[PDB]
Amino acid sequence: RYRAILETAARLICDRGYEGTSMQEIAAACRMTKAGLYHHIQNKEQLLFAIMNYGMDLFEEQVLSRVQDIANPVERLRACMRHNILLVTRGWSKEVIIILHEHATLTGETRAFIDARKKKYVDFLEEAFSQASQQGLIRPVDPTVGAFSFLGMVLWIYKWFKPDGRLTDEQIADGMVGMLFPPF
Amino acid sequence: RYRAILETAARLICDRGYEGTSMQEIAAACRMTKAGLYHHIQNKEQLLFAIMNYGMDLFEEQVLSRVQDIANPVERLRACMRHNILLVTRGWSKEVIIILHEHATLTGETRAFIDARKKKYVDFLEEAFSQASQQGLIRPVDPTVGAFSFLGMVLWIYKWFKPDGRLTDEQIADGMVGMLFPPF
Numbered sequence: 001r002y003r004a005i006l007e008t009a010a011r012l013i014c015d016r017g018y019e020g021t022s023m024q025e026i027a028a029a030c031r032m033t034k035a036g037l038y039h040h041i042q043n044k045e046q047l048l049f050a051i052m053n054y055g056m057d058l059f060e061e062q063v064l065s066r067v068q069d070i071a072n073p074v075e076r077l078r079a080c081m082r083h084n085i086l087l088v089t090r091g092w093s094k095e096v097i098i099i100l101h102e103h104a105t106l107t108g109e110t111r112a113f114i115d116a117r118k119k120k121y122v123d124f125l126e127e128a129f130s131q132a133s134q135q136g137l138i139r140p141v142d143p144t145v146g147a148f149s150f151l152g153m154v155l156w157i158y159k160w161f162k163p164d165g166r167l168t169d170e171q172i173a174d175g176m177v178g179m180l181f182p183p184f
Numbered sequence: 185r186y187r188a189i190l191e192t193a194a195r196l197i198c199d200r201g202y203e204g205t206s207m208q209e210i211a212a213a214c215r216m217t218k219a220g221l222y223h224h225i226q227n228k229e230q231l232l233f234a235i236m237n238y239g240m241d242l243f244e245e246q247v248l249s250r251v252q253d254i255a256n257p258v259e260r261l262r263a264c265m266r267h268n269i270l271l272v273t274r275g276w277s278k279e280v281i282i283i284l285h286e287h288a289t290l291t292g293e294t295r296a297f298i299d300a301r302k303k304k305y306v307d308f309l310e311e312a313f314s315q316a317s318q319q320g321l322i323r324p325v326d327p328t329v330g331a332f333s334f335l336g337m338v339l340w341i342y343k344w345f346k347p348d349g350r351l352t353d354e355q356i357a358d359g360m361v362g363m364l365f366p367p368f
């Protein structure tokens with residue numbers, strides 16, 4: 001219900017961009033009037049804030065919640081990569097893309113909160129790289145270098161991947177997992 | 185003399201973005217009137233075109249021209265990664281960012297000309313991944329997945345790396361090379 005307003009405004013802000021869209025174009029795209037929409041939402045910046053928070057809820061529901069308890073740290077990184085790739089290459093890519101593109105559009109207060117949620121994921125990856133090196137499950141590497149290589153590989157996917165293409169997202173996930181986390 | 189206009193305008197277009205930077209603004213950052221600037225550049229999108237080609241020229245002079253003849257295909261990928269990482273982390277970080285952020289700004293022949301130079305790099309990486317797989321120098325992997333994992337790791341650096349930080353760019357290059365192209 002109320003999520004339908006976020007998920008529809010995410011489509012416009014994504015294809016057309018944040019600046020290109022106004023609160024009026026989103027009211028039209030909804031069954032509400034320019035007045036009705038402003039009753040559910042404070043302003044435009046807070047609408048963007050709600051979209052990004054919704055995107056992190058989906059990320060944590062489909063990725064972090066499901067892998068953060070995996071005992072073996074490299075098995076935890078492999079699973080995290082698969083879940084994160086599948087999130088990027090399917091329907092919820094709308095809210096994920098807005099988080100990356102519109103990162104700089106937020107105000108100071110709201111960017112601090114969203115980034116706090118992003119930083120928990122980065123710290124999750126770094127900890128897993130650290131544990132995996134100590135236990136001899138991956139070739140040693142600085143945890144920060146490993147985390148941002150992980151994220152660079154995965155999140156770059158939305159720039160080139162086409163679902164009608166030669167390979168499925170599942171085949172891509174297998175390739176990246178085996179290349180960054182091979183048997184060791 | 186002419187690079188001054190491109191370097192200066194790239195700083196603006198990089199910080200303020202393409203839209204939000206006008207010919208009037210650039211004509212001021214450079215000590216000129218609006219017309220004196222037009223004496224050496226056609227229009228705004230031509231300025232963007234020249235900036236992107238300048239950035240691809242720098243990339244080819246510092247990266248591709250120096251590594252494309254390396255015989256061993258995995259040694260070729262390692263060197264290519266090192267050179268590309270150092271390009272992302274140093275004085276020419278402005279032009280490369282514009283090539284990525286403004287990738288969809290151009291259209292027509294100019295767009296196609298830039299995208300052809302970009303596609304030449306991807307195809308270079310894909311060919312080297314293929315050769316290294318057949319020759320048993322890297323763990324087998326689809327060349328397209330290897331190429332865009334390469335590019336994701338390397339180009340994502342502009343979003344987090346700070347030169348005043350804990351690690352140097354050379355240390356980051358060492359870690360990334362060891363992860364993607366270890367002894368095999």
Ligand SMILES: CC(C)CC(=O)SCCNC(=O)CCNC(=O)[C@H](O)C(C)(C)COP(=O)(O)OP(=O)(O)OC[C@H]1O[C@@H](n2cnc3c(N)ncnc32)[C@H](O)[C@@H]1OP(=O)(O)O
Binds near residue numbers: 283284
């Ligand atoms: C110095 C440095 C900044 C130089 C550069 O800019 S290098 C390129 C950096 N930018 C990127 O990597 C962003 C993603 N890459 C691209 O968009 C392309 O490589 C560009 C050369 C920019 C051209 O864009 P575009 O015409 O839209 O290309 P496409 O969207 O058609 O696809 C690009 C390649 O990905 C492939 N692809 C897409 N989906 C799949 C799939 N499901 N399975 C297997 N392959 C797939 C697609 O076939 C294409 O590879 P090619 O076969 O054309 O070599």
Ligand SMILES: CC(C)CC(=O)SCCNC(=O)CCNC(=O)[C@H](O)C(C)(C)COP(=O)(O)OP(=O)(O)OC[C@H]1O[C@@H](n2cnc3c(N)ncnc32)[C@H](O)[C@@H]1OP(=O)(O)O
Binds near residue numbers: 055119121347
């Ligand atoms: C659904 C999914 C997409 C969820 C996500 O969004 S995951 C994150 C995706 N975005 C990115 O990866 C972009 C790059 N990452 C970041 O910018 C940060 O992780 C963010 C949390 C997003 C923003 O944090 P922010 O407050 O802006 O801090 P910075 O922008 O300055 O990022 C610098 C952090 O990376 C590290 N770093 C930077 N330079 C170096 C260096 N020379 N040597 C070693 N480490 C370095 C450094 O650790 C820093 O993090 P801190 O230790 O300062 O907390």
Ligand SMILES: [Cl-]
Binds near residue numbers: 079082083
């Ligand atoms: Cl899984």
Ligand SMILES: [Cl-]
Binds near residue numbers: 066067079
């Ligand atoms: Cl799982």
Ligand SMILES: [Cl-]
Binds near residue numbers: 099100103
């Ligand atoms: Cl970000």
Ligand SMILES: [Cl-]
Binds near residue numbers: 283284287302
């Ligand atoms: Cl691009």
Ligand code: NI
Binds near residue numbers: 079082083
């Ligand atoms: Ni799973």
